[PDB]
Tab-separated table of C-alpha atoms and ligand atoms in Angstrom:
chain	number	residue	atom	x	y	z
M	1	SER	CA	-45.278	-5.480	13.178
M	2	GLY	CA	-47.043	-2.126	13.685
M	3	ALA	CA	-49.133	0.562	11.977
M	4	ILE	CA	-50.183	4.275	12.048
M	5	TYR	CA	-53.845	5.135	12.511
M	6	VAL	CA	-54.782	8.625	11.290
M	7	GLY	CA	-58.400	9.496	10.507
M	8	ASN	CA	-59.883	6.733	8.333
M	9	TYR	CA	-56.410	5.496	7.293
M	10	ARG	CA	-54.134	2.654	8.365
M	11	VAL	CA	-50.411	2.953	7.321
M	12	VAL	CA	-48.293	-0.259	7.257
M	13	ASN	CA	-45.010	-1.545	5.692
M	14	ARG	CA	-46.041	-2.672	2.187
M	15	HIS	CA	-44.192	-6.021	2.566
M	16	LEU	CA	-46.288	-6.806	5.678
M	17	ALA	CA	-49.769	-5.692	4.440
M	18	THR	CA	-52.575	-8.204	4.992
M	19	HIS	CA	-55.370	-9.387	2.609
M	20	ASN	CA	-57.651	-6.785	4.273
M	21	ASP	CA	-55.196	-3.956	3.570
M	22	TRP	CA	-55.148	-4.924	-0.172
M	23	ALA	CA	-58.963	-5.409	-0.298
M	24	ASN	CA	-59.274	-1.795	1.092
M	25	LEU	CA	-56.231	-0.283	-0.751
M	26	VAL	CA	-55.951	3.573	-0.814
M	27	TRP	CA	-52.335	3.972	-2.013
M	28	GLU	CA	-49.205	1.796	-2.175
M	29	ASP	CA	-45.613	2.466	-3.203
M	30	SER	CA	-43.190	-0.483	-3.548
M	31	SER	CA	-40.189	1.902	-3.784
M	32	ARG	CA	-41.027	3.334	-0.293
M	33	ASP	CA	-42.173	0.042	1.301
M	34	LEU	CA	-45.537	1.810	2.167
M	35	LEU	CA	-49.189	0.859	1.860
M	36	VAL	CA	-52.215	2.797	3.147
M	37	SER	CA	-55.607	1.082	3.629
M	38	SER	CA	-59.019	2.447	4.691
M	39	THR	CA	-60.590	1.877	8.163
M	40	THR	CA	-64.123	2.080	9.565
M	41	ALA	CA	-62.998	3.358	13.016
M	42	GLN	CA	-61.299	6.778	13.430
M	43	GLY	CA	-57.570	7.188	14.155
M	44	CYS	CA	-56.052	9.662	16.579
M	45	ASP	CA	-52.285	9.489	15.749
M	46	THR	CA	-50.962	12.936	14.819
M	47	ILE	CA	-48.580	13.133	11.851
M	48	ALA	CA	-45.576	15.461	12.220
M	49	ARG	CA	-45.155	18.105	9.489
M	50	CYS	CA	-41.496	19.167	9.986
M	51	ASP	CA	-37.762	18.634	9.042
M	52	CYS	CA	-36.738	17.137	12.428
M	53	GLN	CA	-33.638	14.973	12.584
M	54	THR	CA	-34.023	13.731	16.222
M	55	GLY	CA	-36.791	11.594	17.667
M	56	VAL	CA	-37.679	8.341	19.544
M	57	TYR	CA	-38.589	4.962	17.997
M	58	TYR	CA	-40.118	1.760	19.459
M	59	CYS	CA	-37.959	-1.399	19.109
M	60	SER	CA	-40.082	-4.535	19.642
M	61	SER	CA	-37.020	-6.819	19.686
M	62	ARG	CA	-35.893	-4.966	22.877
M	63	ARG	CA	-39.339	-3.807	24.278
M	64	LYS	CA	-37.729	-0.360	24.546
M	65	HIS	CA	-38.004	3.134	23.057
M	66	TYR	CA	-34.707	4.587	21.877
M	67	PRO	CA	-33.834	8.248	21.164
M	68	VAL	CA	-32.088	8.624	17.764
M	69	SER	CA	-30.584	11.167	15.353
M	70	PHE	CA	-31.755	10.332	11.830
M	71	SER	CA	-30.884	11.364	8.285
M	72	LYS	CA	-33.050	13.326	5.839
M	73	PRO	CA	-35.397	11.303	3.526
M	74	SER	CA	-33.398	9.877	0.660
M	75	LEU	CA	-32.892	7.087	-1.946
M	76	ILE	CA	-30.890	4.397	-0.210
M	77	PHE	CA	-29.899	0.996	-1.635
M	78	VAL	CA	-31.575	-1.957	0.135
M	79	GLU	CA	-30.190	-5.481	-0.314
M	80	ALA	CA	-32.437	-8.244	-1.703
M	81	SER	CA	-34.844	-9.983	0.672
M	82	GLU	CA	-37.676	-12.566	0.475
M	83	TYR	CA	-39.974	-9.453	-0.033
M	84	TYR	CA	-38.118	-7.418	-2.685
M	85	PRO	CA	-35.161	-7.796	-5.088
M	86	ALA	CA	-32.095	-5.479	-4.530
M	87	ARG	CA	-33.251	-1.862	-5.175
M	88	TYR	CA	-33.109	1.801	-4.115
M	89	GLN	CA	-35.839	2.508	-1.520
M	90	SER	CA	-36.933	6.144	-1.612
M	91	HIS	CA	-37.978	8.459	1.306
M	92	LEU	CA	-35.771	6.365	3.690
M	93	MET	CA	-34.026	7.826	6.796
M	94	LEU	CA	-31.212	6.025	8.684
M	95	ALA	CA	-30.101	6.101	12.346
M	96	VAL	CA	-27.582	4.216	14.482
M	97	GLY	CA	-29.608	1.776	16.523
M	98	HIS	CA	-31.002	-1.707	16.878
M	99	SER	CA	-33.417	-3.239	14.297
M	100	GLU	CA	-34.072	-6.970	13.470
M	101	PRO	CA	-36.759	-8.174	10.926
M	102	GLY	CA	-39.815	-8.251	13.261
M	103	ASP	CA	-39.106	-4.623	14.187
M	104	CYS	CA	-40.719	-3.134	11.003
M	105	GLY	CA	-43.822	-1.056	11.870
M	106	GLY	CA	-42.363	0.408	15.102
M	107	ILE	CA	-43.187	4.126	15.121
M	108	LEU	CA	-40.622	6.964	15.089
M	109	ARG	CA	-41.806	10.242	16.704
M	110	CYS	CA	-40.417	13.734	17.216
M	111	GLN	CA	-41.872	16.599	19.405
M	112	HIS	CA	-44.413	17.217	16.498
M	113	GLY	CA	-45.866	13.674	16.199
M	114	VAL	CA	-45.427	10.598	13.981
M	115	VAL	CA	-42.471	10.840	11.571
M	116	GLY	CA	-42.556	7.314	10.127
M	117	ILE	CA	-42.093	3.600	10.701
M	118	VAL	CA	-39.175	1.116	10.916
M	119	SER	CA	-38.556	-0.377	7.471
M	120	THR	CA	-34.840	-1.511	7.377
M	121	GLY	CA	-32.203	-2.878	9.827
M	122	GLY	CA	-29.006	-4.898	10.324
M	123	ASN	CA	-25.367	-3.665	10.607
M	124	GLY	CA	-26.135	-1.660	13.752
M	125	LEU	CA	-28.401	0.615	11.667
M	126	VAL	CA	-32.152	1.307	11.514
M	127	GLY	CA	-34.132	2.630	8.537
M	128	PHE	CA	-37.458	4.538	8.737
M	129	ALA	CA	-39.961	5.046	5.943
M	130	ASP	CA	-40.877	8.765	6.186
M	131	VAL	CA	-44.625	9.680	6.219
M	132	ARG	CA	-44.409	13.522	6.825
M	133	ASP	CA	-44.835	14.355	3.093
M	134	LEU	CA	-48.193	12.497	2.857
M	135	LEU	CA	-50.300	15.560	3.578
M	136	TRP	CA	-53.501	13.779	2.383
M	137	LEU	CA	-53.432	11.512	5.479
M	138	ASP	CA	-54.818	14.460	7.531
M	139	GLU	CA	-57.684	15.179	5.150
L	1	LIG	C1	-32.946	-6.854	3.402
L	1	LIG	N1	-32.689	-5.727	4.295
L	1	LIG	C2	-31.730	-4.768	4.103
L	1	LIG	C3	-31.805	-3.944	5.168
L	1	LIG	N2	-32.789	-4.361	6.031
L	1	LIG	C4	-33.308	-5.434	5.469
L	1	LIG	C5	-34.508	-6.178	6.005
L	1	LIG	C6	-34.675	-5.824	7.475
L	1	LIG	C7	-35.703	-4.992	7.905
L	1	LIG	C8	-35.820	-4.646	9.241
L	1	LIG	C9	-34.919	-5.131	10.163
L	1	LIG	C10	-33.898	-5.964	9.752
L	1	LIG	C11	-33.776	-6.312	8.418
L	1	LIG	N3	-35.673	-5.782	5.201
L	1	LIG	C12	-35.892	-4.397	4.768
L	1	LIG	C13	-37.294	-4.442	4.195
L	1	LIG	C14	-37.439	-3.474	3.032
L	1	LIG	N4	-37.776	-2.235	3.347
L	1	LIG	O1	-37.220	-3.831	1.874
L	1	LIG	C15	-37.477	-5.901	3.766
L	1	LIG	C16	-36.558	-6.660	4.683
L	1	LIG	O2	-36.537	-7.870	4.874
L	2	ZN	ZN1	-40.748	17.284	14.220
């Protein structure tokens, strides 16, 4: 689990969004595994606006932060799951590292702020749903 809090927005993995997220829906995209909902309290997370390919992510299944090199946002095939059928997930970045199902929502950060959140795993790999293109989060 895990989310980003920026201004009056809450950003979560779409497959883990609650009833409250859907009742206060701002934007959702199944192909990116993202959903944004509105909040009453203000958020202070800073979103990175960059093309960084190195950063640090939080891995709940290890209670550790790990530094990683990650790929550029792209369309990557994601095997079927209880949440989605087999499909290409867009805006996804991969890194070599640990990720098991309950790790989704862990934040990835570079020197400029929040890059995205854990969205895929297995095979000694970790996938992050990029959020740096969502310029409307800051305004
Ligand atoms: C099914 N699959 C393929 C690669 N990874 C997964 C698992 C997964 C996620 C995180 C850690 C470990 C495994 N995901 C990815 C999520 C998605 N974005 O669609 C849904 C899901 O269950
Ligand atoms: Zn950066």
